[PDB]
Amino acid sequence: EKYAITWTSPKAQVFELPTGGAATMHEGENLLYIARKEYGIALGGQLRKFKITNYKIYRILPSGETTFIHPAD
Amino acid sequence: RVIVDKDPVPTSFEKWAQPGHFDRTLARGPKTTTWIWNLHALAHDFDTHTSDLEDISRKIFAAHFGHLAVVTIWLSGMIFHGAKFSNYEAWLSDPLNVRPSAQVVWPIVGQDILNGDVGGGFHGIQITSGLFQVWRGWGITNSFQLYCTAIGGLVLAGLFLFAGWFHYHKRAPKLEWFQNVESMLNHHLQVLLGCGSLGWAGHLIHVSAPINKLMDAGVAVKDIPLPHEFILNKSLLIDLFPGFAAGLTPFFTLNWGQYADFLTFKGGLNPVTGGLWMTDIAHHHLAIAVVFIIAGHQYRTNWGIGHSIKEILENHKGPFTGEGHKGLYENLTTSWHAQLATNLAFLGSLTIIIAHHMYAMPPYPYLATDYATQLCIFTHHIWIGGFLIVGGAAHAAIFMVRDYDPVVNQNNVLDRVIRHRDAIISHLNWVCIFLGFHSFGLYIHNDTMRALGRPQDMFSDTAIQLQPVFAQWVQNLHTLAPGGTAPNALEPVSYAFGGGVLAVGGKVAMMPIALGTADFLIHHIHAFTIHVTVLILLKGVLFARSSRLIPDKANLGFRFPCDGPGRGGTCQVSGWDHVFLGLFWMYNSLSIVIFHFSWKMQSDVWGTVDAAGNVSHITGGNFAQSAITINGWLRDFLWAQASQVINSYGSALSAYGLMFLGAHFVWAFSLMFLFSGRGYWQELIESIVWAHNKLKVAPAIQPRALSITQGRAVGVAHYLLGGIATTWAFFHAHILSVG
Amino acid sequence: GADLTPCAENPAFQALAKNARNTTADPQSGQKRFERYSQALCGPEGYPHLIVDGRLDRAGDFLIPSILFLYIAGWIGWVGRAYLQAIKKDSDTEQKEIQLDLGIALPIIATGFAWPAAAVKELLSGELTAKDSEITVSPR
Amino acid sequence: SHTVKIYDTCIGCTQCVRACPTDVLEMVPWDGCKAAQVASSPRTEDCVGCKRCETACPTDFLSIRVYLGAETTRSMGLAY
Amino acid sequence: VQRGSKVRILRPESYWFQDVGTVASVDQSGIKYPVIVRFDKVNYAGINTNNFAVDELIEVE
Amino acid sequence: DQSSYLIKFISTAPVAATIWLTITAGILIEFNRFFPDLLFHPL
């Protein structure tokens, strides 16, 4: 696994997974393990129509290192 | 529940003046020549404008009256051209010798040589569309019945064109009139199909089959009475069809066996015409009609009783498929492309079934007699059926981009094919590869074994059998069905399975088609070229919204060229481009179906019967040992049968000689668009705009090269046009000479 | 050469004269082209071989249609040139390209027959061409 | 990876930052232009060569340019 | 120059090289290319405006 | 004025070029019914 993306949702609603297909986010903090960073921004723009701008893409190395790479601040 | 808006759109010539009024971006005026092509491209795309489904649906229903007018103008034109400019009254006296002809050519530039002698003192182009078989099958005897039909068609073409004005510019329906799909299916299955075939069943019994029975006796053409005298003078419906004096009461006392003279179940071909029995078609379209009027009482309307489609689909769900068919009602009652994908992949697949069910069971008088007609009716509706299946695949990919909704389509069977779409494609990728080696490589095996002088190592009828056991068996069941599993028949459903040879004059109407080793290979070539076509079209449907390469492909659109040179290169990733690649394989698949047809029927069906019953075929019976090698498909089919199309100068087949070469040109011309790219041609125009800037002939609308998507679209339209027209001009000039 | 003896003397051109095909429904359009083609030069095949040299006994092949074409072809360029000169000094000029200003296009069409008298006038005045400092060019 | 050069002619339109799908680009303040910010590419090891950033830039000629270089796993766009 | 002055372009990489523009607005301090020139014909991107330096232009009015 | 929209429609690109190329093609056709086979000028 690599590049975890987390976001906080106000409620539950059906979104579209970048890997193809539709899932249902929880209310509160979510977590999705994707393959590449290109999925997380293509998902992060799909959150923008849900009025969510609190998404954080990590970088999970196989050693266990999790590097916060989006945003920079 | 009819609610209709009153005058939405004013009828005016205002918007005819400015072009491209429909789109807000495109109406501001042209700046380059890109605007000229986007006007003709975004023209009949009514969905891009608004989100108002009520406003779009009124444009769609009114334009559908526009296409009904141009079909009726076309159809009444073919009757009118067959009324004046034809030899229909000389064809009825001798269909065995007089060739079907219309379209007399004006004599100006020496093209009067195209008006060749077809027989009957008449000079014109020998038609192959088979309208003389239809008009005799309708029972038309003289020219005046063709005039009043064609003049009647021109009136009926005017009512469709008036109602298209009326139901849009004057009285347009609301939205909820369109979404009464339970109320639509009840009227369209009963009144259109059921009552249409019940009324036509009344036309064979009272009119057509009395005339076609007097024709088979060989009485005359003029001496046969007018078909309204068959209704008045009932004594002529009792000389023929003796089960008619009992009248109307055996219908209502359930004495339906009284009607056994003119609602028969003969089950075979008429030995005089080589067509179907007219009494069997009468009992067909009547029994067709009862089933449709019953089954159109199914769906619920204003009176409570009836099924509901939102309650049929949501019950059918299983353990494997989760919520099942729950949610597919809202896809098919809101989106117009979901309807257009469904009504076109299943009407295009229907058209191919019509082509197979008309060469073996010729439904018209003297249809199987004319080899030139029967070859061309098959090969016509083959191509018409194949374009629509690609269109159903096209407008399904458009559904996935614009009209797909995640909220409705949650965990239903549409959602569950996008989870395992990698398992669908990669298991389909294997079968396309598996069928590629084990069907085409058995031709490459046979090419090499015959070239190496090893004929005993080939997959032929002599050396290594590959006999089609599962289709030789089904022919033996359909041969033995009269007396057995269908005792009421006499001969089989057709003579293509078994039975005997039915000769009409000298020419074979239908002979039992024997399947062998060459027929095993070519039916598995067909399964190969169809599964590959499905592979390309379904990949454009499943990967329409995203893939592992592009996670946001639906953000870009249905029709975009690429996503740049990165990721190795992402050109032709769109859902449009998989429709583009499937048009070639559709062309590839259907060209072999019409080549299998045009050489199996000539080698093993068609020909002349001698006195003792010996059947002398056209090509002498060489499909068996030559349709197993690619040399044999080149020598004995493409090379040997083209000796009538290229030797046809100075004769009436000269236009097929010119369309044979002229279509080789347009095919080769299309490769300039397919192979090259846009960015070359934009650079070249910059050096031609310079010489146009120098002499002050600089155009205000700037020249641009064709766009990336359009350069592909021009290159496939000129490809399919020249490739089919080659075959169009090759089938005609071969079969208008040996037939 | 090769064997360009005139068509009136040929056994081959007279053999092609006996099986004439009527061009138009005129019943002697088959005959009224072979007597017209007798002054041309038929080779060994029996077909008139045109001479584009410029010889005045053979002016009908190429010399006469060349003046006839270049009057009509330099017309269509000059009409299409002088219209685009006019519309550039207007309000929009892109509407008048696809949607023809018929009030302006029709005086230009009637004007044309002194285009050799106008093109030479435009040539000597230096208003035929444009300056190379005023045309866009590609970076070298 | 690839190479993203940003010249000094852009206007701070923020159309190239809102188009690069791997988020290579970001705006830094810069007292030159009218909008007082220039695009910058501090994360060019993530760039996939998409050239969406060159398509969205207004200025003629382009202030941003992607030079296609050596292609590692992140720039090939491989999920495997 | 001023709002309405026809100028010419000498930037070779630009699309409207040696073509006649029309100055729409001139800025005061920054960018180094402070002259907005509203052209009349469009480039391949479809736009018809650009920024240019002060010494880049050739006034023709 | 409804009539001005018909002059303005008859002078668009495909409509004018359909009529003008029909008059052009009809001149070549009716010249060739009456004077056919004109390979060269007869002098």
Ligand code: CLA
């Ligand atoms: C029931 C029939 C039907 C209907 C109503 C539609 C309707 C539509 N289609 Mg569709 N389609 C169909 C069948 C149909 N299609 C079939 C059978 C195919 C497979 C080939 C397609 C493939 C297809 C694609 C790939 C696309 C559409 C698109 C569209 C939309 C806009 C089309 C448009 O404006 O074209 C305007 C008309 C033209 C551009 C003219 C095209 C002319 C063709 C290429 C040449 C015809 C050759 C002709 C027979 C020979 C002429 C010879 C010449 C010498 C005169 C519209 C909703 C487009 C879209 O974006 O949808 C939203 C789109 O991208 N369709």
Ligand code: CLA
């Ligand atoms: C004659 C030309 C030709 C050939 C051979 C192929 C071959 C193929 N195309 Mg293809 N294609 C072509 C033209 C051709 N295409 C054109 C013109 C287009 C343009 C539209 C396309 C578009 C296209 C698409 C869009 C797709 C294909 C697909 C396929 C594959 C189908 C699987 C298959 O049958 O492989 C089996 C191989 C053969 C039938 C070739 C015969 C090989 C023999 C039997 C064995 C080799 C002999 C010997 C052992 C060699 C070794 C000798 C040693 C000394 C080295 C295959 C690679 C599809 C694909 O890849 O998915 C499956 C696919 O999606 N093609």
Ligand code: CLA
């Ligand atoms: C106003 C009309 C016009 C005029 C005067 C010229 C003049 C010229 N063109 Mg050009 N051209 C035009 C229209 C015109 N072009 C159009 C519409 C096209 C697109 C098809 C081209 C495509 C083109 C190419 C590709 C090339 C030229 C070239 C040339 C030069 C040599 C002549 C030649 O080869 O003819 C070329 C003619 C054609 C290719 C076809 C002619 C186009 C139509 C048939 C004529 C236009 C008539 C116009 C629509 C009438 C409008 C009337 C108005 C009142 C409404 C010369 C500068 C050549 C060059 O650079 O040489 C140095 C060259 O390579 N032109």
Ligand SMILES: CC1=C(/C=C/C(C)=C/C=C/C(C)=C/C=C/C=C(C)/C=C/C=C(C)/C=C/C2=C(C)CCCC2(C)C)C(C)(C)CCC1
């Ligand atoms: C060819 C053509 C044409 C013509 C057509 C026609 C001629 C039509 C007709 C039509 C008709 C002529 C129809 C009919 C129909 C009928 C029906 C539809 C009937 C029904 C009935 C019923 C339903 C009955 C029943 C009943 C009984 C029996 C008893 C009890 C009661 C009741 C009433 C229920 C046209 C012109 C278009 C043109 C194109 C082509």
Ligand SMILES: CC1=C(C/C=C(\C)CCC[C@H](C)CCC[C@H](C)CCCC(C)C)C(=O)c2ccccc2C1=O
């Ligand atoms: C040749 C070619 C071109 C250039 C071809 C063009 C532009 C075709 C245009 C030719 C027609 C004739 C232009 C018509 C212009 C006027 C309508 C001509 C006036 C004539 C009328 C009076 C009939 C591309 O733009 C292109 C784009 C993408 C992939 C491949 C290719 C490609 O192969």
Ligand code: SF4
């Ligand atoms: S279509 Fe052309 S521009 Fe687009 S990615 Fe492919 S090669 Fe590059």
Ligand code: SF4
């Ligand atoms: S490079 Fe392009 S997108 Fe980025 S600031 Fe400059 S003009 Fe704007």
Ligand code: SF4
């Ligand atoms: S390579 Fe181009 S498209 Fe990809 S992120 Fe960088 S600037 Fe954007």
